[PDB]
Write an enzyme that holds these catalytic residues in place. Structure first.
Site, PDB file in Angstrom:
ATOM      1  N   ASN A  24       0.801  -1.208   0.000  1.00 45.86           N
ATOM      2  CA  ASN A  24       0.000   0.000   0.000  1.00 45.86           C
ATOM      3  C   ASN A  24       0.844   1.272   0.000  1.00 45.86           C
ATOM      4  O   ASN A  24       1.947   1.302   0.545  1.00 45.86           O
ATOM      5  CB  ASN A  24      -0.987   0.019   1.176  1.00 45.86           C
ATOM      6  CG  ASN A  24      -2.096   1.024   0.977  1.00 45.86           C
ATOM      7  OD1 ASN A  24      -2.348   1.460  -0.148  1.00 45.86           O
ATOM      8  ND2 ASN A  24      -2.773   1.397   2.064  1.00 45.86           N
TER       9      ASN A  24
ATOM     10  N   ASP B 209       4.539  -5.811   2.707  1.00 47.46           N
ATOM     11  CA  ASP B 209       3.165  -5.394   2.976  1.00 47.46           C
ATOM     12  C   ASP B 209       2.230  -6.286   2.137  1.00 47.46           C
ATOM     13  O   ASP B 209       2.426  -7.514   2.094  1.00 47.46           O
ATOM     14  CB  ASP B 209       3.031  -3.875   2.713  1.00 47.46           C
ATOM     15  CG  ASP B 209       1.650  -3.298   3.096  1.00 47.46           C
ATOM     16  OD1 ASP B 209       1.312  -3.259   4.292  1.00 47.46           O
ATOM     17  OD2 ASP B 209       0.918  -2.845   2.188  1.00 47.46           O
ATOM     18  N   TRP B 210       1.248  -5.693   1.464  1.00 49.57           N
ATOM     19  CA  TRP B 210       0.280  -6.454   0.658  1.00 49.57           C
ATOM     20  C   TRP B 210       0.917  -7.080  -0.569  1.00 49.57           C
ATOM     21  O   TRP B 210       0.354  -8.017  -1.148  1.00 49.57           O
ATOM     22  CB  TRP B 210      -0.893  -5.568   0.240  1.00 49.57           C
ATOM     23  CG  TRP B 210      -1.868  -5.387   1.338  1.00 49.57           C
ATOM     24  CD1 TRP B 210      -2.066  -4.275   2.073  1.00 49.57           C
ATOM     25  CD2 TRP B 210      -2.791  -6.366   1.815  1.00 49.57           C
ATOM     26  NE1 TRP B 210      -3.055  -4.497   3.010  1.00 49.57           N
ATOM     27  CE2 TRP B 210      -3.520  -5.778   2.859  1.00 49.57           C
ATOM     28  CE3 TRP B 210      -3.077  -7.687   1.451  1.00 49.57           C
ATOM     29  CZ2 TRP B 210      -4.524  -6.467   3.555  1.00 49.57           C
ATOM     30  CZ3 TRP B 210      -4.058  -8.375   2.145  1.00 49.57           C
ATOM     31  CH2 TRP B 210      -4.771  -7.766   3.180  1.00 49.57           C
TER      32      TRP B 210
ATOM     33  N   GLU C 230       7.700  -6.963   6.705  1.00 52.21           N
ATOM     34  CA  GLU C 230       6.515  -6.188   7.110  1.00 52.21           C
ATOM     35  C   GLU C 230       5.290  -6.703   6.360  1.00 52.21           C
ATOM     36  O   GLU C 230       4.521  -5.944   5.784  1.00 52.21           O
ATOM     37  CB  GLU C 230       6.741  -4.708   6.845  1.00 52.21           C
ATOM     38  CG  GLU C 230       7.697  -4.060   7.844  1.00 52.21           C
ATOM     39  CD  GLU C 230       7.046  -3.750   9.183  1.00 52.21           C
ATOM     40  OE1 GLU C 230       5.937  -3.187   9.208  1.00 52.21           O
ATOM     41  OE2 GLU C 230       7.662  -4.042  10.220  1.00 52.21           O
TER      42      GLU C 230
ATOM     43  N   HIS D 267       8.283   0.928   8.915  1.00 52.49           N
ATOM     44  CA  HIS D 267       7.513   0.063   7.987  1.00 52.49           C
ATOM     45  C   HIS D 267       8.140   0.042   6.599  1.00 52.49           C
ATOM     46  O   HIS D 267       8.348  -1.022   6.025  1.00 52.49           O
ATOM     47  CB  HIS D 267       6.048   0.496   7.891  1.00 52.49           C
ATOM     48  CG  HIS D 267       5.255  -0.284   6.881  1.00 52.49           C
ATOM     49  ND1 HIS D 267       4.926  -1.613   7.055  1.00 52.49           N
ATOM     50  CD2 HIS D 267       4.744   0.076   5.682  1.00 52.49           C
ATOM     51  CE1 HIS D 267       4.227  -2.029   6.010  1.00 52.49           C
ATOM     52  NE2 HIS D 267       4.111  -1.027   5.159  1.00 52.49           N
TER      53      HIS D 267
END
Length: 298
Positions: A51, A118-119, A142, A273
């Site tokens: 994201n 992330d995603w 992450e 992050h």
């Protein structure tokens, strides 16, 4: 108080500079913008952002790996300089639809190496689950490693306000989760796709709305994550590298989850992050050595 890296401007890659190095390929009813290092195509390392970001995130990491393997880095649909989703939907499976279609046009080797954040990691993990014979190794950080049991407004109409109107994830969250202060041009590269108000910012709202919360989370995404988590926990022959962020940001559940996956090497680098912006070279070198070891072991 955050400060600029005083040596960073001399090697800065602006958005325009990065986008000039990328190519575009038609995919389904749209197109994908991507970076492709081309050489050493016997292997393929595919880097997936999550994201708020784009392929730009990986710009200082990839040069370390390029000499060992072909490196391919897309902008996910509706993000970066890629085209938009034909129906304007940006759920995990929409992203996966375009990503998998793109993969088919890339002349990939039989077994592929993934690097996910992330995603982007969730996309890699889901791909792995559904293509168990096509995966050489996985690096993650992450990442969406499992469903969340333990420890609303984003899903409400205010969430649309927070993001589509007020650009919360790009203009508030992103810089808060980088330890350094970004150069103005670097932040501008992240803002560019989402500079205008309204629907163009949809992907940055849709992503957090996919969160795999057992209580209240999208049931289809919760199942996707349960499925790939069980598979990853049993994947003893699949080499993995988990890059831990130090101190990270609320990142303890990620680390304990990551430890349930067998055949994982553990390393640690500076960051909250978006660790690519705080320790790209350390990350790149770790990834390089891992990939080298994976290929020799074959």
């Amino acid at each position: 108080s955050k400060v600029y890296d005083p040596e960073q401007r001399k090697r800065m890659i602006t958005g325009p500079q990065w986008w000039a190095r990328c190519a575009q390929m038609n995919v389904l009813d749209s197109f994908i913008n991507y970076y492709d290092s081309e050489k050493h195509a016997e292997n393929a390392v595919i880097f997936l952002h999550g994201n708020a970001t784009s392929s730009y995130l990986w710009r200082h990491v990839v040069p370390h790996i390029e000499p060992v393997a072909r490196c391919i880095i897309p902008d996910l649909i509706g993000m970066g300089k890629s085209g938009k989703s034909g129906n304007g939907s940006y759920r995990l499976l929409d992203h996966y639809k375009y990503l998998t279609a793109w993969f088919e046009l890339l002349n990939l080797p039989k077994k592929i190496i993934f690097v996910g954040h992330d995603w982007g990691a969730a996309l890699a993990f889901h791909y792995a689950y559904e293509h168990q014979d096509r995966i050489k190794a996985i690096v993650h950080m992450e990442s969406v490693v499992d469903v969340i049991e333990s420890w609303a407004l984003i899903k409400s109409e205010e969430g649309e306000k927070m993001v589509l109107e007020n650009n919360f994830f790009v203009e508030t969250v992103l810089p808060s989760k980088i330890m350094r202060k970004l150069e103005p041009e670097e932040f501008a590269a992240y803002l560019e796709p989402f500079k205008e108000k309204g629907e163009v910012r949809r992907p940055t709202l849709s992503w957090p709305r996919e969160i795999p919360l057992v209580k209240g989370g999208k049931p289809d995404v919760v199942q996707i994550v349960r499925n790939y988590n069980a598979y990853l926990r049993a994947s003893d022959d699949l080499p993995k590298l988990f890059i831990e962020s130090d101190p990270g940001f609320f990142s303890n559940a990620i680390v304990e989850g990551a430890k349930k996956f067998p055949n994982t090497a553990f390393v640690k680098v500076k960051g909250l992050h978006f660790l690519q912006e705080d320790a790209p070279d350390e990350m790149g070198k770790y990834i390089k050595s891992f990939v080298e070891r994976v290929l020799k072991n074959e």
